[PDB]
Amino acid sequence: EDDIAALVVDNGSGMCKAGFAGDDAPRAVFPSIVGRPRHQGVMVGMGQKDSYVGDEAQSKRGILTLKYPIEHGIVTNWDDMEKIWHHTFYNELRVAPEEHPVLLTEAPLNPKANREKMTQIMFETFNTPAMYVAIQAVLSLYASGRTTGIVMDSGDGVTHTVPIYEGYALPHAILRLDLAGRDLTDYLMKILTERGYSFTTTAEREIVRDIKEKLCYVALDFEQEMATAASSSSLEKSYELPDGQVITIGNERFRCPEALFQPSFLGMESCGIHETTYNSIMKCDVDIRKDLYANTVLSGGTTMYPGIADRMQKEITALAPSTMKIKIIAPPERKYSVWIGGSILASLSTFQQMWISKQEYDESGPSIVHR
């Protein structure tokens, strides 16, 4: 089978999401980290080990050395990227990827030599019978219905603006913007000291990334929300913690999603999120631009906010013409919306002649990924 006997690996922009197909929720998610203790000796608290990867490495960080395989959303090193693939297949799931076809993701703008590198890894070391290379952009759009429209990739890494027309994406419109959710959490840190609250460990700095998606909310019309904050409305919240540090928010409730449209709070001259949305559609074909406005889809970890659908609607109408019917399609889950699209593509009625198998890899090498 492949409805349940196929694996959906969604290698995100900082988190790996593995799990069998057919479900609407991934099995095991954790941040993609590896850890190397450079020498041996005694190991206390955990087992004597030459390499802590995954969940045993997240409990020991000032004990270990840290390494991110996914920086700026693109794989920078291929040794530790396979080490997490070794960790997800055999330790957190414990199934052999030698009989089950494996569905893995990629970046929309990665080179073909990187795309040939990941085909060489899955066939030789894991011995998969078949696989398929799919962009993360087409999976989130397929979970939103038909395969036409533009998706707003804003994860932990680099924002992608990929317009897709009926399953085929545009070559010269994949715009790369350096706005990231890690920049906004660092932006929240440099205005928390103005309140007077600081840090002493890295563990207190970790929960700011949780508070960025939990406590901070999107207000429709950020511009009066700071005007009502100028007249001292009730918008200051103070979250309580078990230890003595009390992290509060003031006007930083609405400002970390306001930094998406206003990058001057981040300290740069770059385009806003609605601007790189508008700049991508402004170089498409003029007849398919109407099909892109009515199928705007939000996805990622930075976009995890309540009330963000109508805020993106009112922001795009000032640049787009007023005769276009624009609809922001906001799913309830969007970090995992790429994973549910990879599972419904796995449960397609016909996927058997699209398999990249071991036989064609032996006959044409890793250039069969060109398809």
């Binding site: 939103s144 219905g145 038909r146 009515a294 399609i329």
Partner: peptide, 15 residues
């Protein structure tokens, strides 16, 4: 009849 209207409203949220 309300189950057919709820599925049509979900299709109305798609397009």
């Amino acid at each position: 009849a309300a189950a057919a209207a709820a599925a049509a409203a979900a299709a109305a949220a798609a397009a």
